[PDB]
Design a protein around this ligand. Structure first.
Ligand SMILES: CN(C)C(=O)Cn1ncc2ccccc21
Ligand SMILES: [Cl-]
Ligand SMILES: [Cl-]
Length: 163
């Protein structure tokens, strides 16, 4: 575990992370995809061997010895708000199980279902709160990776408000 488990946020490409493993915002079919998923495919293409997994699950595939945790958030274009919210919570619970199983001291994680799976809604708070619900009982250092400068400030504020 980390000596003093923390949350941090950085505004940069998660393919350049400084953590012991990465969470991919994957699609259910193990396809290269776009956004975080395409960056992850470029950096760790070997981790897409048999990475297909259903919505609300996570499946880990090693790229060398570096673990890529493929976490499949719901696409809110297809799910109801209620069912989508349940599957988004479940994907992060499966990430916490994998992070624990791997024995890593740190993990790089994007906000699931906030980009092309958001169904055109701002889900920063919904996705981040489900991330915290899952990860709070883990002792890994968590580093959240984002793109938007306003999102960086809001995630940083949310982390600080609990400390
Ligand atoms: C400037 N460049 C090369 C990019 O926009 C690449 N990139 N990809 C993800 C990401 C997150 C924050 C900042 C830059 C990011
Ligand atoms: Cl997304
Ligand atoms: Cl963002």
């Amino acid at each position: 575990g980390a000596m003093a488990p923390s949350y941090r946020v950085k505004r940069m490409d998660i393919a350049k992370n400084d953590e012991e493993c990465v969470v991919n915002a994957a699609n259910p079919r193990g396809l290269p995809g776009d956004g975080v998923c395409k960056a992850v495919y470029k950096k760790w293409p070997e981790s897409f061997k048999n990475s297909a997994t259903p919505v609300g699950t996570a499946k880990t595939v090693m790229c060398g010895t570096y673990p890529v945790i493929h976490a499949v958030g719901p696409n809110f274009s297809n799910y109801t708000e209620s069912e989508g919210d349940r599957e988004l919570a479940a994907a992060y619970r499966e990430v916490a199980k994998e992070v624990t199983r791997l024995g890593v001291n740190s993990v790089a994680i994007p906000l699931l279902s906030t980009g092309v799976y958001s169904g055109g809604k701002d889900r920063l708070t919904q996705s981040l709160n489900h991330l915290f619900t899952a990860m709070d009982s883990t002792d890994a250092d968590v580093v959240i990776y984002c793109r938007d400068k306003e999102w960086e400030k809001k995630i940083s504020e949310a982390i600080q408000m609990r400390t």
